């Protein structure tokens, strides 16, 4: 027997345990609202033929009136956001920012620090394990779309077991050729192109006939509670920027291509519920980082 698993699910490193209180979550919400206003100030500046809309938003964000010679960097709020982002990623990251500074920055805007008002759908495919007989080969490639290429060389048809975990809500399988799939201890149906499955149903058995390889393409949907202001387009852009700037360069941490892979991997850990709450605050922090750094590149 051989076991194959998704690469991004392996060894999720512990996330930080600081800056998760009500006051700190309000600061992240305040920064996101202020950073959003900073981006829209540029469009308003063009319409008004003046820098007044931008100067207003930068003064609120950075608590200082900009001078022409100075390179605008965001001031104390930008520094606080950066250090908070590093702390969330790893338990080894130090917590530089004091709580007094966080509370002062959180009072700049009137916005709640809630994180459970809305939901979001994440598309990473959690193939926890694939168990296959001896004379067969199985390879798993991809995160957003998981392609499983299976080829057997034995005389008889082989049974391959797919485990998609318990977190995901819906998994849709499509094959290069029609194939047979059924739940554990269930009758095998006729060959079909597509299957819609609920991961809580149990391990799924795939009949693999001898001959040409069979490739199954997998897509998954998972619901995670997020703030209403959450925007997946901005969060993913902020994730790449944070990696580029080295905010995640800490010893003994894992690395992921997208924030979708990061949050799904932590959800499948033993303490998944506690880890996800920290990761959602990181996503809103990354959303603010993307807006603030695009308006004020350094």
């Amino acid at each position: 027997a051989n076991r194959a698993t998704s690469a991004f699910l392996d060894n999720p490193h512990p996330v930080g345990v600081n800056y998760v209180d009500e006051g700190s979550r309000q600061f992240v919400a305040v920064a996101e609202l202020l950073a959003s206003k900073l981006i829209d100030s540029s469009r308003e500046s063009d319409e008004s033929n003046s820098d007044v809309p931008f100067v207003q938003a930068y003064s609120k964000f950075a608590d200082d009136n900009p001078r022409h010679l100075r390179v605008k960097t965001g001031g104390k709020m930008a520094n606080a956001l950066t250090n908070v982002i590093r702390s969330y990623y790893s338990i080894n990251a130090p917590a530089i920012v004091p709580q007094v500074e966080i509370d002062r920055l959180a009072s700049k805007a009137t916005v709640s620090g809630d994180m459970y008002n809305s939901y979001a759908i994440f598309n990473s495919v959690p193939i926890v394990e694939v168990l296959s007989p001896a004379r067969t080969t199985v390879s798993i490639v991809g995160s957003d779309r998981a392609d499983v290429t299976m080829l057997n060389t034995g005389a008889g048809a082989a049974n391959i077991t797919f485990n998609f975990g318990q977190i995901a809500e819906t998994v849709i399988l499509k094959g290069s050729v029609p194939f047979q799939l059924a739940r554990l201890n269930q009758p095998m149906p006729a060959a079909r192109f597509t299957y819609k499955l609920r991961p809580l149903d149990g391990p799924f058995i795939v009949v693999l006939p001898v001959g040409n390889p069979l490739v199954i393409s997998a897509t998954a949907a998972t619901r995670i509670q997020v703030p209403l202001a959450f925007n997946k387009a901005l969060v993913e852009s902020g994730f790449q920027t944070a990696m580029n700037d080295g905010l995640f360069d800490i010893q003994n941490v894992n690395y992921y291509s997208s924030f979708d892979e990061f949050i799904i991997s932590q959800y499948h850990a033993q303490d998944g519920i506690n880890r996800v709450s920290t990761c959602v605050i990181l996503g809103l922090a990354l959303q603010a980082y993307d807006q603030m750094r695009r308006a004020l590149p350094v």
């Binding site: 308003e44 008004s48 033929n49 007044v52 809309p53 207003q56 609120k60």
Partner: peptide, 14 residues
């Protein structure tokens, strides 16, 4: 004179 409604609302609210 040149400030818009949104800009004026921010000045008074601050």
């Amino acid at each position: 004179n040149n400030d818009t409604i949104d800009v004026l609302k921010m000045k008074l609210r601050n």
